[PDB]
């Protein structure tokens, strides 16, 4: 049986881990995913497959935990994935569980870079030990913590990660980086950041009008803090604002698909 071993964790004659490389190709074939850092939050946008009449909703009681591509990890961290869907779900469970362990232990939200490191260490582990394929996923993490403010990360099949102000993974990611490079700037509102995301998806899907049913957008931003329960917790202290991860519905994308088509005709 050892003659039928594929040797997934064995270097090859140039210091190259072929299975790490082929798994990165798989991500380039996947739906486009874009992340943008703004002053008022992070924006994640993703193209979806083509919409069959016969699809249905899961009809979940809460709509801001998962779309087709966006996932909450914790209330100050969300993400989008490109690559093998079932592989993404295994790692997203890993990350949800690690983020909540940290809350369990320190009663404080895990820092987004700390979370990202644990994620990437899990990936690296299947590159060195264990005779099985690696995870074929790339993530974009949107985060808020008090150490570093808004943060956007990208995680690659090698178990590497890096921070960005805008990024794109999946299909037409060179075409997409070209556009963000041109039009990103360090003074964006969150509403402009959303627009810019929609334009970049409009130019990689290859349509003149933005079909609102082919788009998913999520935002990691801050909102005013809820009730202060000073009677049940006399030494509770909440900040004015707290992070929220939000998966924008069609009724919020109406004045924003409109402002991306007036910037498409005036060009």
């Amino acid at each position: 049986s050892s003659r039928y071993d594929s040797r997934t964790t064995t270097f090859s004659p140039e210091g190259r881990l072929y299975q790490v490389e082929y798994a990165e190709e798989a991500i380039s074939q996947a739906g486009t995913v874009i992340g943008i850092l703004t002053t008022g939050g992070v924006v994640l946008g993703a193209e979806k497959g083509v919409q069959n009449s016969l699809f249905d909703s899961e009809n979940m009681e809460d709509k801001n935990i998962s779309g087709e591509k966006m996932y909450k990890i914790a209330s100050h961290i969300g993400c989008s994935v490109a690559g093998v869907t079932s592989d993404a779900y295994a790692l997203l469970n890993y990350a949800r569980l690690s983020a909540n362990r940290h809350h369990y232990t320190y009663q404080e939200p895990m820092a987004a870079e700390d979370l990202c490191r644990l994620l990437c260490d899990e990936k690296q582990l299947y590159t060195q030990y264990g005779g099985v394929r690696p995870f074929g996923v790339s993530f974009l993490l949107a985060g808020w913590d008090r150490h570093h403010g808004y943060q956007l990360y990208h995680t690659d099949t090698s178990g590497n990660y890096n921070a960005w102000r805008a990024y794109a993974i999946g299909q037409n990611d060179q075409v997409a980086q070209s556009l963000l490079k041109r039009d990103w700037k360090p003074e964006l509102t969150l509403d402009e950041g959303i627009v810019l995301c929609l334009r970049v998806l409009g130019k990689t899907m290859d349509t003149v009008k933005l079909s609102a049913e082919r788009l998913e957008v999520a935002v990691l931003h801050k909102v005013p803090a809820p009730a202060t329960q000073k009677l049940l917790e006399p030494y509770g202290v909440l900040p004015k604002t707290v992070p929220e991860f939000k998966i924008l519905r069609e009724t919020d994308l109406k004045p924003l698909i409109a402002e991306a088509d007036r910037q498409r005709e005036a060009e």
Binding site: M60, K72, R101, H103
Partner: protein, 204 residues
């Protein structure tokens, strides 16, 4: 006894599309009083309140386990847990530890957001539920709480009359108990609102 080391008492009563849950504010080491500002109530979601009494290290640790499991539930399930499942869950965790228990005794009070039906549960320390329709209570003055509630509680009551019943109960019972006291905190819950009140009491 170990369940009485830290002090404290909790009580929950039902009315008509409402409940009230109350706890005392004392934390102690047998007779020495450490703090007078430790209420024992934990809000799980809009519909569920948890009371915990027993040894404070185990109240602190067991409520953190409940919080952890609830957070994971909400991400997997994309919804809030209902009062009855939360209680079955709590029960399961206590009995996981059947031969080496958490010294806590929980009081869960809930309301079905749709039907407006009120669910109360109290548990022993290995998770046996006691789910009547009037009230539940636990902690160091549970004996003296029983008879206050049997004589004051009546079916049907609305939020404001249920609150008086439940505050007179807790005060009169804490006043014959040396390990619970320093006034109280009460949550009053309907389908529509959640009111909290800090009640004055004796300073012994």
């Amino acid at each position: 006894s170990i369940l009485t080391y830290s002090g404290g008492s909790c009580l929950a009563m039902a009315g008509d599309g409402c409940f009230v849950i109350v706890s005392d504010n004392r934390l102690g080491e047998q007779l020495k009083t450490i703090s007078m500002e430790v209420p024992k109530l934990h809000v799980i979601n809009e519909s569920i309140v948890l009371g915990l009494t027993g040894l404070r290290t185990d109240q602190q640790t067991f409520s953190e386990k409940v919080r952890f499991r609830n957070e994971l539930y909400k991400l997997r399930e994309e919804r809030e847990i209902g009062g009855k499942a939360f209680a079955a869950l709590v029960s399961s965790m206590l009995y996981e530890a059947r031969f080496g228990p958490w010294f806590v005794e929980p009081v869960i009070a809930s309301i079905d957001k749709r039907t407006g039906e009120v669910y109360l549960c109290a548990m022993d320390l290995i998770g046996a539920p006691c789910e009547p329709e009037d009230y539940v209570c636990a902690g160091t003055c549970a004996e003296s709480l029983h008879g206050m509630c049997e004589a004051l509680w009546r079916p049907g009551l609305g939020p404001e009359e249920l609150f008086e019943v439940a505050a007179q109960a807790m005060l009169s019972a804490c006043d014959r108990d040396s390990l619970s006291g320093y006034g109280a905190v009460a949550a009053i819950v309907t389908r529509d609102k959640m009111t909290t009140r800090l009640i004055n009491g004796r300073k012994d």
